[PDB]
């Protein structure tokens, strides 16, 4: 079966629509998500047109094998989608109405710059390659773009699922290729990050600053070193659930900054002890007393600067 | 093939049933479970009618390809079910009795609010989409809904497997959809959490409170810090076997609360030492003596408050 | 093709056999194992009978598609087996001899009560569903049940592979089902657990008891706490390679008991120090001296009691 | 269908091209990467030639089954490529223009010698085996070799995707094989390694060197031992994300060198204490004072030597 | 299609050959490896013989479906191989020359006794089952057994790939089976284990022995305990990348031995302190002085004994 011939020299408009049934497995490291949805396609094939009076039927149903069907592919998929044709309906004028249900692992990159307070725009790119006979062009039927209310992405809030109505038409290997951009806007559920990593990470840091109320070098060493080991554990746990970014992230910045605070506390603890042994604890006292205000004030201001730069 | 034609204007009732053979792999992080079960379907196709006098047989057998079979799909599956048609039997009136055995990764969300003392209601949604010729409607044959006695879901107790007999009939992309809700009620076996996670977590917390019977700042720092690190390990181990919830969980609350208890013990240990050095151990003694009763009493009451809020 | 018709009203006996080629991947958490084996089936279809003098041939070979073959399934498999028909041979009387080679992920539960000194009975359940024409019943041909000598299950000793000759015949969805139980008896190779997990766990416990020969509260705190953190690592390592059991296991008991020993040592270390500070080291000495005998004696007796209860 | 016959006994030149759609999953340990791309093939089959004036058509489209298609196979793939024929076009002369879209897990080794400041050359090898009728030879059509702008490999910069135009023709099992080398040049984005692994690893090393300003053996033991445990965690974290190389890597060197610095600091801390106890702290002072300059200077020079050897 | 009939009563000799293309993923815990290779088969079928004069052709090419092809299987594979027939050529005398390219997960056990200085012999077993018509026997065509030069097994050196020319002919389920043994000899690249696991493990042990030059019980406890924890981390990192063996391994022995050295050092540290407190440091001094020579000497001799027993 060949593509429907043009009346004049017009391209064949294939109207598309994606209706999300299930959205799942959003992998941050892999920058992938899984989607189970309906794909609807509609085009006019005049060869399939009929008289409802003569045929007695208002709609004719066909098996895929029986008629010409446009080769639609997804651009950003790991492997080609698992599809099951649900229905093919031909109206009397020849307007084919194709519907299939598919599942695909979509590969769409994420911007971790504001993590875990980030929002994302996931993309699903539909594509058709023109044939020799005639050029195929994609269109969006907004009445057939959606998601069911129950669609739930674990750990994310689904804001919108819309399509960019104007396709990106371009040459690829001397043939036209009509590309459509379906956008799924999601925003991260940061609630858990607060009681789970943020607050515990801050408490173990504040526990380290109790060394500013102690003269016991042995206890201070223990305090600042032990908490630094706890911070290493947090920093490992955080970074292992994120991909290696060529840009600095908000969480990355915070984690790095905290390492400097530990390093500078070790230096303070060291200086204080050196002076006490040198029989000059008056200098050590003034240094320690300053640190009690300095460390929190600088930490607080540095965070204000950081949050400001990132948001 | 086309769907069986209506005698009058009635929809085609497809009677369904699911009989669970093996229900396994319930993944808490993924909020998915695997199921291997029988799917039974029964509908009338008068076209298939026969005389057993002429045909010789009292029941006719068919290959799926040979007759019209309703396109039944699962709503909440990762990928389309792996099915194997077990049997297709047509009685003289044209009543079809279809049976297949399938396997599926069902994606049904869990409520972790009372974890590990939570119960769940897993869902398996059956759906049929109406055709142009006639409307298809799902029904439940309760004689064909069940589970074998041996069905075991590791670390869960299977309470019931029932179906919500009245289907959810609704429009979707200008066609009728008949949706059935199969409910598998399970409850978590929390036994292991007690000797494994709970009691060890409580002993290492009580071990830290022995610092209320010591004056050695160096030993107290060691005690409270070391046990804090043990609790960091605990919390990570617990937290990595749960998904990131936008709501606070019972275990999450307990774990968070325990972090405050360590932070407040570090403060007590710090205050006690400061006073000892300040040559006023009478204040330090009274503060420490209070802490011995305070810490357990407050911990016990806080837990009573927490358990109350969550159950 | 319909099933072979009965001479009288007898059921069709399908003789079965499983000959294990490879046994691998016994996952303890998942309570699954992978199997690669031959499945042999034999039944009499008189329609296929021939004269060996007239046909010249002793045996006729058929393609599966050509003749009626009973739909045999495995009950306890994750997904349906990957089979390849090796041979179909028909004798003059009409005795069909079918042979296929298959692979499957069997889901058979384990009893962790005596782990790592446990033995298991893995099950492979064969099942046939009766048809409307006639009832199919399974049988065991013991001459076709076995395993090759080289079958090796890593970290397990294969004792026997036998079949329970009497099938479990029962009604399921108003049709007869004939179920056969194939039992693979294995016993765990516990050797490695001794130099790997057991002895190191016991040494780090005995290391903590050296605090009974020390008066240094700071050194005892260090000793008992450090060894406790090592035990936490041991316990996590052990329990992450086991599923969550609703029953107490031998290893689980030992691990929990050891936790108590650390808690009670912390108490001893605390009491000894309190008394030393209270200027009464005579009581502290007698308490410590007792602990030196008490701790090992109690540990040894508690283990005798435990081993007795579990074996 | 047999291969096209030669006019004069020349080999059949199959012109090839690979246009990368998506690059993903570069696994360093596995030395594998995944690709989704277009594969274009073009050859002359005179049997397929037609008249364009008489036939009215300038191009004829065929189903793969209809014509002879050269068996093109990737050398370095885990399993054979998933492919979907996009189009087959025949020009009047009989020039076939085949296009398929495929996915493959390519196995191309990496050189970890300069990690994480390394660049790589990934390979995709195309191969054709000659037939008895005639020899098939591969060629590169540079106008059909490329990648889309959006191709992104997470944590890697894509430099170029080119082909080595001259095929490696050789005998294999008494038949000619024509092999083509497609090269994808990538370079690691090392940015993240600096705030994440490098700077933290250097700070915990510098923290250990504060023991050169302390006389407290107990505090020095704590300092050097604790920071050493931190380095063990770092080194384990780094080494588990790399394969076992028979050559020394840049990071491997750095990590190993750092272990010696900790061993030599333990020795210094030990010597200093021995002398202090031996009532000769003048020697201990001079040894410690030297170490303060020695340790950083030697560390800095050793790194200059190392970086020089590796780059 | 039936098997070729015998001229006399001779068995049908199927000549085989395996030429390795890519050898990857050798999993130590699983005792498996992946292989991608050519499988060549050749047998005489006189029914296929032809006159090269009357046919004009010197070789006839067939589709698998067209002719009889022996059912060749691999014994030790997880699931049946993924094959693609490359070519089927019939010479005038009727000699079929079949060639396919396949991929398989071969399950061949490893001997970890000398790990990481071990060598292995991986096996690939080819098998054919005899039919009632005639008994099929495998043979090795040494000209068709090999590997390409580029075959690389990450972290292993490929020594040889040979076949044991004499097949193991035996009865299995009342039919003969002809089994061939293909042996791939590999040896582990132990280089990395030295800077990575061995030297760091030895240095953290030597760091513990500095407690023989200290009188500070608190510092010795810290030293011997901290290092013991580092050895636990090592011992896990090692053992988790190895399967549970019923035999003692070289690395297992070394690791176990080192645990005794830590236990005995804790005992020494304990005894030394007890005596110091007992106001008899002359005994403590002589015990400590002995330990300084004893510990390394015994460690060195124990290793010589161990290496001797294992190599
Ligand atoms: C250690 C540092 C502690 C973390 C501080 C919060 C970071 C922040 O300031 O987060 C800010 C984000 C909101 O960002 P947004 O509105 O979605 O971005 C859009 C921004 N525009 C205007 C640039 C487009 O989250 C919050 O509401 C913060 C609530 C969490 C508080 C946790 C405190 C502990
Ligand atoms: C009497 C002193 C009470 C101290 C209360 C501590 C408040 C911490 C609030 C954290 C809020 C989040 C930032 C934490 C610093 C640790 C404080 C050390 C206290 C030293 C006691 C001196 C005794 C006179
Ligand atoms: C540290 C915190 C200690 C944990 C306290 C147990 C939590 C609890 O009280 O858990 C309660 C759950 C039962 O809940 P349910 O009946 O299934 O819920 C339905 C409840 N409604 C419908 C009436 C609201 O388990 C138990 O029987 C508790 C046994 C575990 C005791 C562990 C002691 C240590
Ligand atoms: C810490 C405690 C150390 C563990 C002590 C061994 C437990 C035990 O007693 O184990 C018992 C099992 C034997 O099991 P079985 O004979 O097959 O049981 C069947 C018994 N019936 C049918 C009579 C009921 O193993 C052994 O022979 C123990 C060898 C390992 C000793 C390691 C010591 C270190
Ligand atoms: C007055 C002393 C100031 C100390 C400044 C420390 C600079 C650290 C530079 C890190 C560069 C990145 C190099 C790590 C050694 C830390 C030195 C500890 C200070 C000793 C204090 C003696 C008090 C008189
Ligand atoms: C002057 C002392 C020099 C110390 C040199 C140490 C050699 C270590 C060689 C490692 C072999 C690889 C085996 C390591 C033992 C630690 C030695 C403790 C030194 C005690 C110093 C006493 C001060 C007088
Ligand atoms: C502890 C050691 C700290 C690491 C020091 C950097 C290693 C290095 O010197 O790295 C060098 C590489 C660049 O290598 P290249 O130009 O791509 O190689 C081609 C070389 N030719 C000429 C041989 C062909 O990266 C950099 O630009 C270094 C930036 C990171 C600095 C991190 C400092 C903290
Ligand atoms: C002179 C005393 C030698 C002690 C040898 C220790 C035997 C341990 C055998 C365990 C076998 C497994 C149970 C281990 C207890 C630690 C013993 C502490 C010794 C204290 C020394 C007091 C000096 C008089
Ligand atoms: C902790 C103790 C340090 C480890 C000692 C090495 C073990 C050994 O001596 O190993 C020996 C193996 C060689 O074994 P093979 O030649 O393949 O066996 C053939 C044996 N015959 C003769 C019985 C057939 O490795 C080596 O070449 C040693 C290099 C590694 C040295 C690392 C030292 C640090
Ligand atoms: C589960 C949660 C509270 C948690 C446990 C342990 C450690 C950390 C980091 C913050 C150090 C953490 O996120
Ligand atoms: C997760 C479970 C197996 C576990 C093991 C050992 C100790 C703990 C405490 C410290 C939380 C624990 O939670
Ligand atoms: C490899 C082996 C000796 C090992 C190392 C570290 C800890 C454990 C036990 C204590 C769980 C262990 O099994
Ligand atoms: C360097 C090494 C010790 C390390 C520990 C913990 C966390 C990180 C990053 C996230 C800072 C890290 O790379
Ligand atoms: C002691 C040994 C098992 C070990 C510990 C930490 C780091 C490494 C390498 C990466 C140096 C290592 O293999
Ligand atoms: Cl697609
Ligand atoms: Cl489906
Ligand atoms: Cl099955
Ligand atoms: Cl391929
Ligand atoms: Cl096979
Ligand atoms: Na079509
Ligand atoms: Na059908
Ligand atoms: Na300490
Ligand atoms: Na059949
Ligand atoms: Na073809
Ligand atoms: Na084809
Ligand atoms: Na064949």
Coordinates of C-alpha atoms in Angstrom, one line a residue, chain B residues 72-285:
Chain B
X72 CA -9.6 -6.3 27.3
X73 CA -6.7 -4.3 28.7
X74 CA -5.3 -3.6 32.2
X75 CA -5.3 0.1 33.1
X76 CA -2.5 0.1 35.7
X77 CA 0.2 -2.1 34.2
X78 CA 3.8 -1.1 33.5
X79 CA 3.8 -3.0 30.1
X80 CA 1.0 -5.1 28.4
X81 CA 0.3 -8.5 30.1
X82 CA 2.0 -11.7 29.0
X83 CA -1.0 -13.9 28.1
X84 CA -1.4 -17.5 27.0
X85 CA -4.9 -18.5 25.9
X86 CA -5.7 -21.7 27.9
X87 CA -9.1 -22.4 26.2
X88 CA -12.0 -20.9 24.0
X89 CA -15.3 -22.9 24.3
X90 CA -18.5 -22.0 22.4
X91 CA -21.8 -23.6 23.5
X92 CA -24.7 -24.1 20.9
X93 CA -26.3 -20.6 21.6
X94 CA -23.0 -18.9 20.8
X95 CA -21.9 -18.3 24.4
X96 CA -18.2 -18.0 24.4
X97 CA -16.1 -19.0 27.4
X98 CA -12.5 -17.6 27.0
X99 CA -9.8 -18.4 29.5
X100 CA -6.1 -17.2 29.5
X101 CA -3.3 -17.2 32.0
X102 CA -1.4 -13.9 32.3
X103 CA 1.4 -12.2 34.2
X104 CA 1.6 -8.5 34.8
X105 CA 3.5 -5.8 36.8
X106 CA 0.7 -3.9 38.3
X107 CA 1.3 -0.3 39.4
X108 CA -0.9 0.5 42.5
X109 CA 0.1 3.2 45.0
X110 CA 0.7 2.5 48.7
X111 CA 0.0 4.7 51.8
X112 CA 3.2 4.6 54.0
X113 CA 1.6 6.9 56.7
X114 CA 1.4 3.9 59.2
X115 CA 4.5 1.9 58.0
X116 CA 5.6 -0.7 59.1
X117 CA 2.1 -1.3 60.8
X118 CA 0.3 -0.4 57.5
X119 CA -2.3 -2.4 55.4
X120 CA -2.9 -1.8 51.7
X121 CA -5.6 -2.2 49.0
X122 CA -3.9 -3.1 45.7
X123 CA -5.9 -2.5 42.5
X124 CA -6.1 -4.3 39.2
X125 CA -8.2 -2.3 36.7
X126 CA -9.8 -4.1 33.7
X127 CA -11.0 -2.0 30.8
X128 CA -12.9 -2.4 27.5
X129 CA -13.3 0.3 24.9
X130 CA -16.6 0.5 22.9
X131 CA -16.6 0.1 19.1
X132 CA -18.5 2.0 16.4
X133 CA -20.9 -1.0 15.8
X134 CA -21.8 -1.5 19.5
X135 CA -21.0 -0.6 23.2
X136 CA -19.1 -3.1 25.3
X137 CA -19.8 -3.3 29.0
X138 CA -17.8 -5.2 31.7
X139 CA -19.4 -7.4 34.4
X140 CA -18.1 -9.5 37.2
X141 CA -18.9 -13.3 37.4
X142 CA -18.2 -13.8 41.1
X143 CA -18.0 -17.6 40.7
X144 CA -14.8 -16.9 38.6
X145 CA -13.1 -14.3 41.0
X146 CA -10.7 -15.8 43.6
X147 CA -7.1 -16.9 44.5
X148 CA -5.6 -20.2 45.4
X149 CA -4.9 -20.9 49.1
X150 CA -1.1 -21.1 48.6
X151 CA -0.9 -17.4 47.1
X152 CA 1.9 -15.9 49.3
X153 CA 3.2 -12.3 49.1
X154 CA 6.5 -12.3 51.0
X155 CA 6.3 -10.2 54.2
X156 CA 2.5 -9.5 53.7
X157 CA -0.7 -11.2 54.8
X158 CA -3.3 -11.5 52.1
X159 CA -6.7 -10.6 53.5
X160 CA -9.1 -10.6 50.5
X161 CA -9.3 -10.5 46.7
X162 CA -12.7 -9.1 45.6
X163 CA -14.2 -7.1 42.7
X164 CA -16.3 -4.0 42.7
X165 CA -19.2 -5.5 40.7
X166 CA -20.6 -2.2 39.2
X167 CA -18.2 -1.0 36.4
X168 CA -17.1 2.6 36.0
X169 CA -18.6 3.5 32.6
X170 CA -17.3 6.8 31.2
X171 CA -16.5 8.6 27.9
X172 CA -12.9 8.8 26.8
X173 CA -11.9 10.3 23.4
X174 CA -15.5 10.2 22.2
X175 CA -16.0 6.5 23.0
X176 CA -17.5 4.5 26.0
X177 CA -15.1 2.8 28.4
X178 CA -16.2 0.2 30.9
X179 CA -13.7 -0.1 33.9
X180 CA -13.7 -2.8 36.6
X181 CA -11.9 -2.5 40.0
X182 CA -10.3 -5.8 41.3
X183 CA -9.1 -5.2 45.0
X184 CA -6.4 -7.2 46.7
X185 CA -6.3 -6.4 50.4
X186 CA -3.0 -7.1 52.1
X187 CA -1.5 -6.1 55.5
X188 CA 2.2 -5.9 56.4
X189 CA 3.9 -8.5 58.6
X190 CA 5.7 -6.1 61.0
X191 CA 7.1 -8.9 63.3
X192 CA 10.7 -8.7 61.9
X193 CA 10.9 -4.8 62.2
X194 CA 10.8 -5.2 66.1
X195 CA 14.0 -7.5 66.7
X196 CA 15.7 -6.1 63.6
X197 CA 15.1 -2.3 63.4
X198 CA 13.0 -1.0 66.4
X199 CA 14.7 -2.6 69.6
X200 CA 18.3 -2.1 68.3
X201 CA 17.5 1.6 67.5
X202 CA 16.0 2.0 71.1
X203 CA 19.0 0.3 72.8
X204 CA 21.6 2.5 71.0
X205 CA 19.4 5.5 72.1
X206 CA 19.3 4.3 75.8
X207 CA 23.1 3.6 75.6
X208 CA 23.6 7.4 74.8
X209 CA 21.5 8.3 77.9
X210 CA 24.3 6.7 80.2
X211 CA 26.1 10.0 79.6
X212 CA 23.6 11.4 82.3
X213 CA 25.6 9.2 84.9
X214 CA 29.0 10.5 83.7
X215 CA 31.0 13.7 84.3
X216 CA 33.7 12.8 81.7
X217 CA 33.0 15.3 78.8
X218 CA 35.4 13.3 76.6
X219 CA 33.4 10.0 77.3
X220 CA 30.0 11.7 76.9
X221 CA 31.1 13.3 73.5
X222 CA 32.2 9.8 72.4
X223 CA 29.0 8.1 73.7
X224 CA 26.4 10.6 72.2
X225 CA 28.4 11.1 68.9
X226 CA 29.0 7.3 68.4
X227 CA 25.4 6.3 69.0
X228 CA 24.3 9.3 66.8
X229 CA 26.3 7.8 63.9
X230 CA 24.6 4.4 64.6
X231 CA 21.3 6.2 64.3
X232 CA 22.5 7.8 61.0
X233 CA 23.2 4.2 59.6
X234 CA 19.8 3.1 60.9
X235 CA 17.8 5.9 59.4
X236 CA 19.6 5.6 56.0
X237 CA 18.9 1.8 56.0
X238 CA 15.2 2.4 56.8
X239 CA 14.8 5.4 54.4
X240 CA 16.3 3.7 51.3
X241 CA 13.6 0.9 51.4
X242 CA 10.8 3.5 51.2
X243 CA 9.7 6.0 48.5
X244 CA 9.9 9.8 49.0
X245 CA 6.4 10.6 50.3
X246 CA 4.9 14.2 50.3
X247 CA 3.3 13.3 53.7
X248 CA 5.0 12.5 57.0
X249 CA 5.2 8.7 57.9
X250 CA 5.0 7.1 61.3
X251 CA 8.6 5.7 61.0
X252 CA 9.8 9.0 59.5
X253 CA 8.4 10.9 62.5
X254 CA 10.0 8.4 65.1
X255 CA 13.4 8.7 63.3
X256 CA 13.2 12.5 63.1
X257 CA 12.2 12.8 66.8
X258 CA 15.2 10.6 67.8
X259 CA 17.6 13.1 65.9
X260 CA 16.2 15.9 68.2
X261 CA 16.9 13.7 71.3
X262 CA 20.6 13.3 70.2
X263 CA 20.9 17.0 69.4
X264 CA 19.4 17.9 72.9
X265 CA 21.7 15.3 74.6
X266 CA 24.8 17.0 72.9
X267 CA 23.4 20.4 74.2
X268 CA 23.1 18.8 77.8
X269 CA 26.6 17.3 77.7
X270 CA 28.0 20.7 76.5
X271 CA 26.1 22.8 79.2
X272 CA 27.2 20.3 82.0
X273 CA 30.9 20.6 80.9
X274 CA 30.7 24.4 80.5
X275 CA 29.4 24.7 84.1
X276 CA 32.0 22.2 85.5
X277 CA 34.9 24.3 84.0
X278 CA 33.1 27.5 85.3
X279 CA 33.7 26.0 88.8
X280 CA 29.9 25.6 89.4
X281 CA 29.2 21.8 89.4
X282 CA 26.1 22.3 91.6
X283 CA 24.1 23.7 88.6
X284 CA 25.6 21.0 86.3
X285 CA 24.6 18.3 88.8

